[PDB]
């Protein structure tokens, strides 16, 4: 059993992260597991622990935060929501790739907690077409572009969401390429011997 | 700037077969790195297509003048990669695909680390001399960036295309493109 990879897809709000993540999971060639979040809220109708969420108490959640066992977390209306280190680690050690789609502020928490993850920045198609366009809106668009390029330096790869199908193909290519790195390939061959 | 893609692996692994299939693929944007040789053309071979056919005098002068990226002599015949052709195509934004023997690949690695080194792996490795070969192939592999099994030629081709596209999507390269656009 080769170690799984944590694949983190982020990028600005409205770039199509949700749509790309859905298409990645619909693709018959992918074999990712979705990251299951831990929450302190109680289950709703049809929800199962270990399937929809890891339902835990506030005490358990805060203890996980204090012990550095939380990759990312936030409190949304008195309820904690977060990505637990223990369950991500168990799946990676069992050889399963985990795919996590998250907002840019959440991604920086995950990056600090798990630098071994593969961080993909989903890019607006307008970023390359910026010059093919001073108004306060033009000044804002140029400022947005500069900050996206600066944010991108924290990521491993940047993929343009020109066509959802194209972003999916590039993401599959990234994950396959990461598994072909000789450090990982040698590990497989040595464990065989 | 174009990427230097170096495909290597042991003799008989199918480097030639995989390189031919890579160039037959309609999606390939790679330009084949044509080697220079002092041997005469074989049946169906053309200068500037299959090889740069040159005399020993020209080749030895290119060696002496530091104009070879890598070279070797095999039973009186020189084979090598001219440095200028590579450097010019890379600067013009063309990706270069170089299929070479393991000893040639290590010359290129020393000269140009920025290259993407792909080790084409025998399928029998996962399945006394055979064990010794396997151990040395695993040891060699550590000097390469990626290792691709030649299980099915079509599968090796898609993994190689995937490697080149992924290297193009690295944020260091993507940021460089966007900054130039910015000004
Ligand atoms: Na596809």
UniProtKB/Swiss-Prot annotation, chain A:
Which residue intervals define the domain Guanylate kinase-like in the entry? 4-176
Q: Indicate the principal place this protein occupies in or around the cell.
A: cytoplasm
- Which reaction equation describes what this protein catalyses? GMP + ATP = GDP + ADP
Please state where this protein is localized: Cytoplasm
| InterPro entries (UniProt xref) | GK/Ca_channel_bsu, Guanylate_kin-like_dom, Guanylate_kinase, Guanylate_kinase_CS, P-loop_NTPase
Q: What is this enzyme's EC? A: 2.7.4.8
- Gene3D superfamilies from the UniProt entry: Guanylate Kinase phosphate binding domain (3.30.63.10), P-loop containing nucleotide triphosphate hydrolases (3.40.50.300)
GO molecular function terms listed in the Swiss-Prot or TrEMBL record: ATP binding; guanylate kinase activity
The record, for NCBIfam families, names: guanyl_kin
User: What name goes with this protein?
Assistant: Guanylate kinase
GN (gene name): gmk
Swiss-Prot record, chain B:
Query: Where does the Guanylate kinase-like domain start and stop, copy by copy?
Result: 2-165
Q: Catalyzes what? A: GMP + ATP = GDP + ADP
Output the Gene Ontology terms for molecular function.
ATP binding; guanylate kinase activity
Q: What are the record keywords, sorted?
A: ATP-binding, Cytoplasm, Kinase, Nucleotide-binding, Transferase
- Top-level taxonomic group: Bacteria
Q: Which residues bind ATP?
A: 9-16
Location in the cell? Cytoplasm
List the EC numbers from the record. Answer: 2.7.4.8
A UniProt-annotated Pfam family:
Guanylate_kin
Q: Name one GO cellular component term.
A: cytosol
Q: Which SMART domains match?
A: GuKc (SM00072)
Q: Which family does it belong to?
A: Belongs to the guanylate kinase family.
- PANTHER family associated with the record: GUANYLATE KINASE (PTHR23117:SF13), GUANYLATE KINASE-RELATED (PTHR23117)
Protein name per its UniProtKB record: Guanylate kinase
**What organism is the protein native to?**
Listeria monocytogenes serovar 1/2a (strain ATCC BAA-679 / EGD-e)
**Higher taxonomy:** Bacteria, Bacillati, Bacillota, Bacilli, Bacillales
